[PDB]
């Protein structure tokens, strides 16, 4: 509720009014402090969601994502204070302002009690990210990249706007509790499909499914490090949160209309993971891997099965923490080599031995190696999907088989092998990069002991 919001927004005057060089320090202090307070919100009751007021409420689904976003907030500050050191204090302050303003919106939307209120800051997250990708992005095609990312989501979000207000004029309020209790069987009338399509496509776009995913490779690669993590670790997941919330009034229409997306997602994950097997760009390879994992959640959410929701929430968080880490891996390597081609800097393990380890559990976590939370996600989803149909395991398991090859492919090409002779600027890794990397992996294994925290309201 408020105990998270005002501390987040009151953090903004601090960064603006802090000393010239202390900006990174005091921002990091209370961002971690905010994370601690958010963790206090992680508690949930049995069945009734933790409701605070007409404006804000939390459930067993929102809380794990809330603590994840606040937990993220220190990490971009940690990950960004290397390529922004040679910048004017105002621009550094502006950069920090963008992140916490972005993070502030995330707390708002996840705790939003009204769908329209959920909707207003659903796209409002775009404005800070658009600035981050465009201004501080370090590339040339970032301009076209920002346009692709911006227009795709709007093209899907605006139908939701017309759909959402239609609910208000037809079924009174759009309070999440009032929708759930007063749910009615959506008919099969040919208007209700376009009703169904509008209420779904908005979350489809910013949850890249095959076909509606070309923004993500352009979104991730040209975005700066902080932009890439926030976009891949939370931003691809507003779509996820919407579906678990909005599919309450899409049944039984979801039963019949689910087919085109399920085939698109299940086949897409094989295709996308195949792209990972032959990606020339390390950041792009990680980006395409996010599509495969996210497309798995598409099948998870859209099956509408108790087990499927549970594994979704497991992959909901685990992928986000993992994808942020892998982007950190690529970023921590990038500036040393000043290039994105994977084969540019081979045999890094012989030069940097600890990064060899950090890359190693990172690849293992993305492998869904048990008992990592990723395995709990994928394995739960497979069982739910298998109950839905026996055939899907052929597609399901094949993804894990492909996921194995490309995951260690980056490991062998970069970490193992012969070091590149020509390069000589690879310095011993700063303990900031090392500290940040453990900041990611350590909570992941810490979460393994308590899956019930992140299983969700279906748990």
């Amino acid at each position: 509720m408020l105990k998270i919001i005002i501390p987040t927004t009151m953090l903004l005057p601090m960064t603006w009014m802090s000393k010239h060089n202390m900006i990174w320090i005091n921002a990091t202090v209370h961002s971690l402090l905010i994370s601690l307070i958010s963790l206090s919100l992680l508690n949930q009751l049995g069945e009734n969601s933790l409701n605070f007021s007409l404006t804000f409420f939390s459930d067993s689904l929102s809380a794990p994502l809330l603590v994840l976003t606040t937990w993220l907030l220190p990490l971009m500050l940690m990950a960004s204070q290397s390529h922004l050191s040679k910048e004017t204090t105002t621009r550094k302050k502006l950069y920090i302002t963008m992140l916490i303003l972005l993070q502030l919106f995330l707390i708002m939307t996840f705790t939003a009690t009204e769908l329209i209120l959920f909707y207003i800051l659903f796209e409002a997250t775009l404005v800070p990210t658009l600035i981050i990708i465009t201004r501080w992005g370090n590339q040339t095609e970032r301009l076209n990249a920002g346009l692709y990312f911006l227009f795709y989501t709007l093209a899907g979000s605006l139908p939701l706007l017309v759909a959402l207000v239609y609910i208000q004029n037809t079924t009174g309020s759009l309070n999440f509790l009032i929708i759930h209790y007063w749910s009615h069987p959506l008919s099969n009338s040919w208007s209700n499909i376009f009703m169904w399509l509008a209420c779904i496509m908005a979350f489809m776009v910013k949850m890249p499914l095959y076909g509606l995913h070309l923004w993500l490779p352009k979104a991730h690669v040209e975005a700066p490090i902080a932009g890439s993590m926030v976009l891949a670790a939370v931003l691809l997941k507003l779509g996820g949160y919407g579906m678990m919330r909005i599919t309450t009034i899409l049944n039984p229409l979801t039963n019949y209309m689910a087919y085109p997306f399920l085939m698109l997602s299940m086949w897409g994950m094989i295709m996308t993971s195949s792209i990972c097997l032959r990606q020339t760009d390390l950041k792009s390879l990680i980006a395409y891997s996010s599509v495969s994992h996210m497309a798995l959640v598409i099948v998870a959410i859209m099956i509408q099965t108790p087990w499927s929701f549970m594994g979704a929430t497991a992959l909901m968080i685990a992928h986000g923490l993992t994808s942020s880490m892998l982007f950190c891996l690529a970023n921590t390597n990038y500036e040393r080599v000043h290039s994105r081609t994977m084969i540019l800097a081979r045999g890094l393990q012989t030069l940097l031995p600890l990064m060899a380890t950090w890359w190693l559990m990172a690849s293992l976590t993305n492998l869904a190696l048990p008992p990592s939370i990723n395995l709990i996600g994928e394995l739960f989803i497979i069982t739910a999907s298998f109950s839905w149909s026996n055939i899907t395991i052929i597609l399901m398991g094949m993804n894990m088989m492909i996921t194995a090859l490309y995951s260690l492919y980056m490991l062998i090409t970069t970490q193992r092998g012969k070091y590149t002779h020509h390069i000589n600027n690879i310095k011993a890794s700063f303990t900031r990069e090392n500290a940040l990397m453990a900041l990611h992996i350590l909570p992941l294994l810490l979460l393994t002991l308590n899956p019930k925290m992140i299983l969700g309201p279906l748990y």
């Binding site: 007409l54 404006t55 939003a112 009690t113 009204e114 329209i116 209120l117 207003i120 208000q168």
Partner: protein, 57 residues
């Protein structure tokens, strides 16, 4: 034994004494539509505020 009327005398408005009754509706007016009922009762605060989307007040 008549007399010449003075100026303005002919233009004087005069009261004429008649026996015919005054017409009831010289225009033959029909019935008149009943006005819509007026507002009444003390003004009360708007129930649950603006009631516009998520705005509580």
């Amino acid at each position: 034994g008549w007399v010449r009327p003075d100026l303005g005398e002919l233009s004087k408005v005069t009261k004429v004494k008649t026996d015919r009754p005054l017409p009831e509706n010289p225009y033959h007016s029909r019935a008149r539509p009943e006005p819509n009922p007026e507002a009444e009762g003390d003004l009360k605060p708007a129930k649950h505020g603006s009631r516009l989307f998520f705005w509580t007040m």
